[PDB]
A paper describes a structure:
CI-producing bacteria produce CI glucanotransferase (CITase; EC 2.4.1.248), which catalyses the production of CIs from dextran by intramolecular transglucosylation, and also catalyses disproportionation, coupling and hydrolytic reactions. CITases and some dextranases (EC 3.2.1.11; displaying endo-dextranolytic activity) are classified into the glycoside hydrolase (GH) family 66 (GH66) based on their primary structures, according to the CAZy database. Paenibacillus sp. 598K uses CITase (CITase from Paenibacillus sp. 598K (PsCITase)) to synthesize CIs from dextran. The core PsCITase structure is composed of four domains, the catalytic domain and three β-domains.
The crystal structures of core PsCITase and its complex with CI-7 (PsCITase–CI-7 complex) were determined by the molecular replacement method at 2.20 and 2.60 Å resolutions respectively. The structural model includes one protein molecule in the crystallographic asymmetric unit. Apart from the sugar and water molecules, one calcium ion and two sodium ions were observed. Some malonate ions were also observed, which were included in the crystallization conditions. The catalytic domain (Domain A, Asp141–Ile420 and Thr548–Asp614) comprising the (β/α)8-barrel is well conserved in GH66 enzymes. Domain C, positioned at the C-terminal side of the catalytic domain (Pro615–Met738), comprises a β-sandwich structure and is composed of Greek key motifs. The overall structure is conserved with that of GH66 enzymes.
Residue numbers in the entry: 40 to 739
Write the structure that this text describes.
């Protein structure tokens, strides 16, 4: 009785040049008591075609996990996704995608780095980079808030680069850590993109060589420069004019310093979004969104002159939507290598988001599109533990303010020696986000010390709110926990301040249902999603270090599948020749399953696309859910054996009907039996979809 499983399959790089050798590794576990000897088979497909096989005999000891490796010379034709399948017979199987692309900008799969601690060792830097590359095919990383000051990015004493420096939120950043992450990125053939603002400088900017004549103002008399107040009467960002050629000259030299000193491949240029009624120093009104494209193009040219292998650029189109602010200007005129857009509430539905991605493509000559679209934003979702049901220590229960959940909340939480002790149960080893719902109208920030299984973790702040009924869940802390029972104690110890009312503790959890639907919708429309970073953290908020939610292992598995599916089938998703097919919503029929062509709520949404070689039908299952992409969702209504008709041209040629999904069979393509026929409505191909859970793709 042989037994086991392939735990992980990955490649040595997230991207390859045509002709590069690819090393594919199956991590194969023998779960039997004794050693297994057997054949392990590699099959590599390109879409429906089997292109390579290989075989070897291996022995794997009882209870052991062994890396089984194959090597493959990638074919010499550029821009090709493949699927590598490793079959170990009785010990199971697994797949991974292979991406052959000379230019990552064609198929960006963008993640992030936000943590640059001195105590992060090279091995830890390499492990978080390697995990993202291996499991999600990430080929580019945005290094978020690596810089010292927004206008002076590397901190120097004379000509020596400081070993560490302190960022705008008082975080300690190590130069060596940044460098080690960059090298680990390059070891995956990745691109390392340096975050920077288009137009920002920190306080006292006159001392760092920046002229206040370059700024932008709320009035024509240069009185009030546009700023961001961080609310401590000290830390500000001041805004400047992207059209001003001296600001350009200063800030583009900083970009080059980042390229040349750290080895970044390019610049991720951010902005704050829509500002109205804006003036330069001299009191001239600015067409503000029209300044961005000249800045970007000059930036691109400056970067290309410095180093044409490390000249990458993108610019964040904030609050993206059809004809949104700066959207047509940037997508239609700016030499970004790929488009990037932060989505807020002007494209809330699937179809609105689709319409936006389509317009970015049409404007830009089918550039890649990456979307920042923070899933489940501000939802206090996950396992909830009510504070009034916890173990109380010199604190009591009450109900005399509006807005609590459960039967009440903890109050008389104002003195040293007072505490609240939650007793939680977690189903697996991993990160858990402790999210505290509380009130505080003390007039000032309160603080408590947090303890986990009796041992001190950290001191947490609790911001003051306008009233005792304005609750907040914006105090959170992530911890790493083993399965089963744990104790979570919030304490007023000596040296803590303020009174607070405590509603609950929630284990902040990303919802997989929404996340899988959104990712499917974006990929079916030709965009990817910046969401993964660090050691499989996910973006919960625009400030990337926010850990207010954590992913559970079932979501991490689904994301691995999804991210490999969009790499292996990248030629049917993101190539410039992938276009919507003109025909409307009676192009496709699903017998006795409600469907739409327009992402209607509670329907199987079908979308028909085509290349020169293939016709493509996407099915995205919105059954049991609405049409809004961001918000947590129900499990979709599972469908089985859907009698499907796809109406086709009488001319069009048809060799077979192929099915693949990130939901079933490790992204492998399945050939489906089908018939051709004609009826009242026209010529069709008929076939049965065996199942539909989130997203299935049929090609022919
Ligand atoms: Ca409560
Ligand atoms: Ca929804
Ligand atoms: Na139907």
């Amino acid at each position: 009785m042989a037994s086991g499983d392939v735990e992980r399959v990955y490649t040595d790089k997230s991207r390859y040049d045509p002709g590069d050798p690819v090393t594919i590794t199956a991590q194969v576990r023998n779960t039997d008591s004794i050693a297994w000897t057997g054949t392990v088979q590699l099959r590599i497909a390109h879409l429906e075609d089997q292109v390579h096989t290989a075989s070897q005999t291996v022995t794997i000891g009882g209870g052991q996990t062994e890396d089984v490796q194959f090597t493959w010379t990638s074919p010499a034709t550029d821009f090709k996704g493949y699927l590598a399948d490793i079959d170990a017979g009785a010990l199971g199987s697994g797949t991974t995608a292979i991406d052959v692309s000379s230019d990552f900008a064609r198929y960006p799969r963008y993640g992030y780095v936000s943590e640059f601690h001195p105590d992060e060792t090279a091995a830890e830097s390499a492990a978080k980079i390697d995990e993202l590359a291996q499991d999600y095919k990430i080929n580019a990383w945005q290094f978020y808030d690596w810089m010292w000051r927004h206008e002076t990015m590397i901190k120097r004493t004379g000509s020596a680069i400081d070993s560490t420096w302190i960022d705008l939120f008082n975080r300690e950043i190590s130069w060596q850590t940044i460098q080690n992450q960059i090298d680990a990125v390059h070891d995956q053939n990745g691109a390392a993109m340096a975050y920077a603002m288009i137009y920002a400088a920190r306080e006292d900017y006159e001392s760092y060589g920046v002229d206040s004549e370059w700024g932008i103002y709320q009035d024509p008399n240069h009185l009030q420069q546009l700023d961001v107040d961080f609310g401590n009467n000290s830390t500000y960002m001041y805004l400047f004019n992207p059209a001003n050629t001296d600001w350009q000259s200063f800030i583009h030299a900083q970009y080059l310093d980042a390229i040349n000193t750290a080895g970044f491949d390019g610049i991720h240029v951010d902005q704050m979004g829509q500002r109205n009624n804006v003036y330069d120093y001299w009191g001239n009104p600015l067409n503000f969104p029209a300044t961005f494209t000249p800045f970007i193009n000059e930036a691109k040219s400056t970067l290309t002159a410095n180093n044409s292998d490390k000249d990458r650029i993108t610019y964040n189109i904030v609050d993206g939507t059809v004809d949104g602010w700066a959207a047509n200007e940037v997508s239609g005129g700016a030499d970004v290598d790929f488009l990037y857009s932060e989505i807020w509430h002007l494209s809330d539905s699937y179809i609105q988001l689709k319409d936006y991605i389509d317009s970015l493509k049409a404007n830009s000559g089918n550039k890649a599109v990456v979307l920042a679209a923070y899933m489940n934003y501000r939802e206090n979702i996950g396992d909830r533990y009510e504070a009034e049901s916890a173990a109380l220590t010199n604190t009591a229960t009450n109900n005399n303010h509006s807005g609590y959940t459960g039967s009440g909340f903890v109050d008389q939480f104002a003195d040293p020696g007072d505490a609240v002790t939650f007793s939680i149960t977690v189903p697996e080893e991993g990160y858990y986000s402790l999210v505290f719902r509380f009130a505080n109208n003390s007039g000032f920030t309160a603080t408590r010390n947090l303890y986990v299984d009796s041992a001190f973790e950290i001191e947490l702040p609790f911001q003051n709110q306008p009233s005792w009924s304005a609750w907040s869940h914006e105090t959170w802390h992530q911890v790493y926990l083993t399965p089963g029972t744990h104790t979570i104690k919030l304490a007023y110890d000596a040296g803590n301040v303020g009174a607070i009312n405590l509603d609950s503790l929630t284990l902040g959890t990303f919802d997989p249902h929404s996340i899988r639907l959104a990712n499917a919708m974006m990929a079916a429309s030709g965009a990817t999603h910046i969401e993964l970073g660090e050691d499989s953290q996910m973006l919960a908020h625009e400030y990337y270090p926010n850990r207010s939610k954590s992913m559970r292992s079932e979501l991490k598995e689904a994301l691995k599948q999804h991210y490999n599916f969009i790499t292996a089938y990248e030629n049917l998703l993101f190539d410039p020749d992938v276009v919507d097919n003109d025909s409307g919503s009676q192009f496709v029929n699903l017998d006795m399953v409600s469907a739409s062509g327009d992402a209607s709520p509670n329907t199987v949404w079908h979308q028909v696309k085509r290349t020169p070689e293939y016709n493509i039908v996407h099915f995205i299952n919105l059954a049991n859910n609405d049409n809004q992409w961001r918000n947590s969702a129900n499990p979709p209504t599972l469908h089985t054996n859907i009698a499907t008709k796809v109406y086709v041209s009488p001319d069009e040629t048809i060799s077979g009907v192929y099915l693949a999904s990130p939901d079933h069979d490790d992204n492998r393509t399945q050939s489906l039996a089908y018939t051709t026929g004609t009826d009242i409505h026209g010529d069709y191909v008929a076939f049965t979809l065996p199942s539909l859970e989130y997203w299935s793709m049929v090609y022919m």
